[PDB]
Ligand binder design. Structure first.
Ligand SMILES: OC[C@H]1O[C@H](OC[C@H]2O[C@H](OC[C@H]3O[C@H](O)[C@H](O)[C@@H](O)[C@@H]3O)[C@H](O)[C@@H](O)[C@@H]2O)[C@H](O)[C@@H](O)[C@@H]1O
Length: 106
């Protein structure tokens, strides 16, 4: 969970308190306009054809790097796992934990 050397996007930290799912993401500043979303499987591990979606927003700079921070926070009915989807300059990038996805306990 460091400022990456080359990864296009990298989840840093996340929390789920029973209702609110939130976190912070390193995002390479490839171009100005960006869409950063969190796509998740619900409490029964249902990915629902990528239809469970939270929009992240720009949080702040990481000066001296080529990265910036984005954050998210939203209510969910339940969550077992998720990945980050990042669209910028006409291409899609993922942090899906090298295909394992990121897990939420319980
Ligand atoms: O709907 C309004 C929108 O406005 C802010 O978002 C700004 C901006 O955030 C992303 O871009 C990052 C970009 O923002 C600043 O201008 C910095 O100067 C840049 O260095 C930095 O790269 C996004 O890609 C843009 O489309 C967006 O306009 C709020 O932060 C948003 O929450 C809010 O939705």
């Amino acid at each position: 969970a460091s400022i990456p050397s080359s990864a296009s996007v990298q989840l840093d930290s996340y929390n789920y308190d029973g209702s609110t799912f939130s976190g912070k993401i390193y995002v390479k500043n490839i171009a100005y306009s960006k869409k950063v979303t969190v796509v998740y499987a619900d409490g029964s591990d249902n990915w629902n054809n990528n239809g469970n979606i939270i929009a992240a927003s720009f949080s702040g700079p990481i000066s001296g790097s080529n990265y910036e921070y984005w954050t998210f926070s939203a209510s969910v009915k339940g969550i077992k796992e998720f990945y980050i989807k990042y669209e910028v300059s006409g291409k899609t990038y993922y942090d899906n934990n090298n295909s394992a996805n990121y897990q939420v306990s319980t």
